[PDB]
Amino acid sequence: AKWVLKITGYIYDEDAGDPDNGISPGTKFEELPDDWVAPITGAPKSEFEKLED
The domain spans of the chain are 1-53
* Residue 1 DSSP one-character state: -
Tell which CATH architecture fits domain 1-53.
Answer: Single Sheet (2.20)
For the sheet containing 49-50, what is the strand order?
A: 10-13, 2-5, 49-50
* Residue 21 DSSP one-character state: T
Extract the runs of DSSP E, i.e. beta strands, from the chain. 2-5, 10-13, 49-50
**Amino acid at site 29:** F
Task: List beta partners, residue 3.
Answer: 12, 50
CA distance 30 to 46: 9
5 contacts 46 by C-beta, under 8 angstroms? no
